[PDB]
Amino acid sequence: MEAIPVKQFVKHIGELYSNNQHGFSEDFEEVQRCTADMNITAEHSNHPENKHKNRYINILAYDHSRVKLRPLPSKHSDYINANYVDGYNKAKAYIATQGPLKSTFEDFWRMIWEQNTGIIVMITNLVEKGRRKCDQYWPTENSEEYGNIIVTLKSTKIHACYTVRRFSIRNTKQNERVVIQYHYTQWPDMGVPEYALPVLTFVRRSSAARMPETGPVLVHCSAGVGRTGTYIVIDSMLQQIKDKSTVNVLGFLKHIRTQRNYLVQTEEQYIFIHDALLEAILGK
Ligand SMILES: CS(=O)(=O)NC(=O)c1sccc1SCc1ccc(Cl)c(Cl)c1
C-alpha cells in the first residue's frame, strides 16, 4: 500500500470497476475486515447515562478518539457521540459526529464552542424518503438559544445542490464567533447519488472556507459514519493530490476506520469517492 501516482489513478479506477466491480469489492471487504484482529473500546458510548445520547444503538464513539465535553457542575456530562478524525498530513482535522438529537443540542453547540469549530458540514436532509434523519439544530430565522450558546442566523444562500448558512454565535458565559454551515441538500427520492461533480464542488468550496488556526471541521450526516466518511476521504485525498500528486484511498480509509466505526459504510460510497477524485483529475 504505497500511494498511487495521480497519473495512473483513473487507469486504476478502470480496473476496480471491471468485471462487475470485483476490484472495488475486494478493496471494501479489506476495509471492513481491517478491524478483525482489533478490539476498540467504546465504554462511554455504552453507559446507561449516555444511551439516550446516541441516535442509533450500534453506532458508537470509540473512547480513544472521542471528543470530550468539558464536564458540568455529573460524571457523564462529558460525553457526546463524536470522534476526532485525521485529515491529510494533519491530526484531528475533523470532528465526525451524528446528527444531533433534541436531547443533545446543547452538547452539540458546546462542543462547537469548546473545540473552536468554525465550519459545519451537513450531509443529510432533516427528512429523507419519509424517514427522520436529523432534528433541526439551528434557527429557522433570527436567533435561538441552546444552553449558554445563542445562535443567530445572519445570511443564507441556496444553490442547486447545497445551501450555505452563515451563523453568528455568542457564549453568554459577549465573545462572538462566525460559524458557517455547508449543507448538501440534494437527495434522490429513490436510490442514491450518481453524479459526483456536484459533490466535488461542494467539497472544494466547503474545504476552502476553513480558516487557518481554527478548530477541527465538524462533519455530520445522520449516523455520522457513511457520508461523513465519504466527505473526509475525498477532502483529504484532494489535499494529498495537491501536495504530492499521489492518491491512497485504501490506506487512508483503513487508518481513519480505527478512529470512528464504519466510516464510509458501503461499497457504493467507496466507489463514489473514486468517482469524485476522477472528476477532479480529469477536470484538470
Ligand atoms: C448509505 S446511503 O445513504 O444508502 N447511500 C449513500 O449515501 C451514497 S451511495 C453513493 C454516494 C452515496 S452519498 C454521496 C455523497 C453525497 C453528498 C456528499 Cl457531500 C458526499 Cl461527501 C457524498
Q: Is 262 in the pocket of ligand 1 (CB under 6 A)?
A: no
Overall resolution, Å: 2.4
**Cβ(276)–Cβ(264) under 8 Å?**
no
Question: Any idea which fold 1-284 has?
Answer: Protein-Tyrosine Phosphatase; Chain A (3.90.190)
Ligand 1 center to residue 45 CA distance, Å? 25
Distance CA 122, CA 163 (A): 10
Compute how many other C-beta atoms are within 10 angstroms of the C-beta atom of residue 10. 14
Long-range contacts of 250-255 (CB under 8 A, 24+ apart): 250/1, 250/27, 250/30, 250/31, 251/1, 251/3, 252/88, 253/31, 253/229, 254/1, 254/30, 254/31, 254/34, 255/86
Ligand 1 center to residue 193 CA distance, Å? 6
2: Cα separation from own chain's centroid: 25
Ligand 1 atom 18, closest CA: 199
The experimental technique used to determine this model is X-ray
Q: Is 162 in the pocket of ligand 1 (CB under 6 A)?
A: no
| Terminal Cα distance for the chain, rounded | 25
Ramachandran bin of 270, using left for φ above 0, alpha for ψ from -120 to 50, beta for the remaining angles: alpha
Distance CA 221, CA 24 (A): 24
Read off the amino acid at residue 188.
P
Ligand 1 atom 4, closest CA: 192
Q: Is 184 in the pocket of ligand 1 (CB under 6 A)?
A: yes
Strands of the sheet with 175-184, listed across from one edge: 82-87, 90-97, 217-220, 119-122, 175-184, 162-171, 149-158, 143-146
Q: Which residues belong to the annotated binding site for substrate?
A: 189, 221-227, 265
For the chain, the residues before each gap (C–N > 2.5 Å) are 73, 173
Read off the amino acid at residue 193.
P
Read off the amino acid at residue 194.
E
Which residues are designated catalytic?
221
**Cβ(134)–Cβ(222) under 8 Å?**
yes
SS3 183: strand
Q: Is 138 in the pocket of ligand 1 (CB under 6 A)?
A: no
The percent of the chain in helix, strand and coil, each rounded to the nearest 5, is 35, 25, 40
